[model samples]
Target: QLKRTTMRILIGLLVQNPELATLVPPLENLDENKLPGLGLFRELVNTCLSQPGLTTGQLLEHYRGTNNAATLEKLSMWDDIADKNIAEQTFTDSLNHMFDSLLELRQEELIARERTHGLSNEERLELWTLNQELAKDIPF
Candidate 1:
């Protein structure tokens, strides 16, 4: 968290937790450590602080589970802490869209990488061809 740029940390958290999208930035009285995915956000933040060799992508890959949906549901009838501001809901929606795209892209990237990482070129080609043939009747 501290290792990342302030904007990245902020945006990253917002992306993960849309509930915060309604809240304005430069948050005061908020303990960042209590927020999910800020410090231990990466499995490598500690290692990186002690040494080098891990790229940002590597660290991110090591740290999975970014999406948070605690506030996604409608607030309960007794819920007084629910956000009253409707305007910020749009921002949260947009951020959720962006997060959805990122999550899909990340999954696809991981799938593609894993499919070919330890396999030879021939094996990858075969797998691709097999998938293509299998999906011919189904729209991807």
Candidate 2:
């Protein structure tokens, strides 16, 4: 899925250079349960931020023995091939993509609610804001 791919790249970048974690904004508002890989991504980011000195291997070690270990190992290999110079921009773009995905999910939820129980005033305003923000970057 797109979310897994994006998080894999982001986590790969962070593992390569833990300091890049500082560039990440607060993600506490994101509902990790709604998206696969989000919880792992968030946990990885927090680990990198908390232990800024961790090397790629060191970071990868944290996931060892867990189901995510293989994924992290693959990402480590990816980090080897990835261009270090573009890591920051890639992280930024991936984060934006994630936000857009979350907005879409929220919008869908509100729309579904409206069709059934209908949205409250606050929910309506939130849905409108999500639509406007999502529309801003439309390529067409």
Candidate 3:
């Protein structure tokens, strides 16, 4: 199991770096039960679609204003995760881990979506482009 700290860091990176969005795991892959505060996490990610390029800390603070149960829980999770695990990892190390995880998840997501929904031509093109882009970071 990935520690809660790791998950929070991953979420932060996923938001802070738009280039990394291609690598975010499908929402379904992010387990809500195992990962408490995931509903809030998903909401935050969706928020990023309209409001781009905010850092992890910025997003946390922005979301904190909500002060609701879900947001509060999400904020607390991030606080604990950062204090405990974020520093030991250089951002590069964490980013690499994120890239690796996203690659795997995207591959699985594409496969499942294709089977279930039958990908459109545009979807195929997008996947091809995304794979080519990701290969620049890792030869996936």
Candidate 4:
């Protein structure tokens, strides 16, 4: 999404539909407008963006989507359009690992800022476009 550094978020995928989350497992328990710890993911994303040119190691240390795009062996969002899995396993592994860690926690741990609570469908669409932009052929 735009907050992911360019496009909007795949935000809608996290709020509007089931296709994206369904493809992944931990997300299986989530429904529209929900993910185990989306609040935490938002926090981590803000943190990563706070620092300029953050590295995978640094990002992973803080990421809580446990985050990042997948390619090659995995592709996060734009996979349908991605020609290659350029981001690499170390990145994917870290994010997936984060996902694992988060799944076990209580929902309160990942709550988003109260002001931003409950996204709308229109906002989600913008996020989807934003996600596509940030991940747009980014070469790792």
Best by TM-score: 2
Task: State which candidate, 2 or 4, has the greater lDDT.
Answer: 2
- Residue-level lDDT tens digits of model 4 in 30-128: 332334334433444454446656544454445334334221112234333233333333234445644544343322222232235754566555445
Where's the lowest-lDDT run of ten residues in candidate 3?
Answer: 75-84
User: Model 3, 1-140: lDDT tens per residue?
Assistant: 22444446655445444334444445756545433445555666676665667655555566664744343444344443444344435344654665566565666677778889988898787677768877881001
**Tens digits of per-residue lDDT for model 2, 1-140:** 22336666677777677778888888888787887778877888898887877888888888799877877777677634278788788888987887778889999999999999988999999999998988981000
Candidate 1 Cα errors over 4 Å, as ranges? 1-86, 118-140
Per-candidate TM equals 0.26, 0.86, 0.35, 0.24
lDDT at position 61, candidate 2: 88
lDDT for model 2 comes to 0.77
* Residue lDDT tens for model 1, 77-104: 1133223454246444543443444444
Per-model root-mean-square deviation over C-alphas: 17.4, 5.4, 9.6, 16.5
Candidate 1 local accuracy as lDDT? 0.38
Give the TM-score (vs. native) of candidate 1: 0.26
Rank list by lDDT: 2, 3, 1, 4
Model 4 lDDT, residue 18, Cα: 19
Q: Alpha-carbon error at 79 in model 1, in Å?
A: 32
- Candidate 4 versus truth, CA RMSD in Å, comes to 16.5
